[PDB]
Paper text:
In our new crystallization attempts of LL-37 in 1% DPC crystals were formed in the presence of 70% MPD. Two antiparallel monomers in the asymmetric unit are crystallographically related to a second dimer, together building a narrow tetrameric 4 nm long channel structure (termed LL-37DPC-4). Notably, this channel does not follow an exact twofold symmetry along the crystallographic channel axis. Disordered residues are observed at both termini resulting in an ordered channel core structure only comprising residues Phe6 to Asn30. Although narrow, the channel shows a continuous and charged inner cavity between the terminal pores with a constriction at the centre. IF1 is further stabilized by two salt bridges involving residues Glu16 and Arg23. The IF2 is stabilized by four hydrophilic residue pairs Lys15/Asn30 and Arg19/Asp26 (contact area 344 Å2). In the interior of the channel-like structure a chloride ion is trapped by two Arg23 residues from adjacent monomers and further coordinated by two water molecules.
Human cathelicidin comprises the cathelin precursor domain and LL-37 as C-terminal extension. LL-37 is activated through proteolytic cleavage as a mature peptide43 comprising 37 amino acids including two N-terminal leucines and a net positive charge of + 6. AMPs in mammals form part of the innate immune response.
Author numbering:
A (entry chain B), D (entry chain B): 5 to 31
B (entry chain A), C (entry chain A): 2 to 31
Amino acid sequence: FFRKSKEKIGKEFKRIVQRIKDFLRNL
Amino acid sequence: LGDFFRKSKEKIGKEFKRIVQRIKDFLRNL
Amino acid sequence: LGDFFRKSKEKIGKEFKRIVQRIKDFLRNL
Amino acid sequence: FFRKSKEKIGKEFKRIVQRIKDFLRNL
Ligand SMILES: [Cl-]
């Protein structure tokens, strides 16, 4: 359960950043 | 039109709620 | 241990809730 | 607002499929 929790934090941050970018580019 | 504007506004609002829900979840749980 | 098991179970449950919430949202709104 | 709504359906389906895969692979 070590670096996988850290790996999860990074994927979730990336997922939200992507979603925000998509929204702004559309409007 | 008219209903096209309403559906577009509804879809925008729902996506804004999706972002806010994801942000809250990330900040509280990580 | 003990609290390691509880936190692991909690994290698993939360991820299961994340999936169910996303599925519901997809099916109802698309 | 044409094919972008269709484009959104496909990204969301892909996002859920990915999340389910990640969960199953972990346990
Ligand atoms: Cl997502």
